[PDB]
């Protein structure tokens, strides 16, 4: 297809602070995207 | 020769920190050393 490579997914979570005496709804999700098989892939583009 | 005074010991424990999203493990001591009874010590070192 191209890359996608997931670790963790998506997740997150709900801490409390102190200090400022409030909550802090947090959400993370780590992957990442490169390329390959240029065989199938292409693209269009107008200019002479 | 010299004593340790002792008081609270030494402790470990874990903690979370969501600024950094890292989280972090302390530990720690406190107590003091001191020389008394000088009469008992000494050393022993090279001559110049």
Chains 1, 2 share one sequence.
Not at 7 to 19: H, I
Not at 38 to 46: I, T
């Amino acid at each position: 297809a191209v890359g996608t490579v997931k670790l963790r997914d998506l997740a997150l979570e709900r801490a409390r602070r102190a200090n400022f005496q409030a909550d802090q709804i947090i959400a993370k999700y780590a992957m990442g995207h490169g390329g390959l098989r240029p065989e199938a892939a292409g693209a269009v583009v107008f200019k002479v």
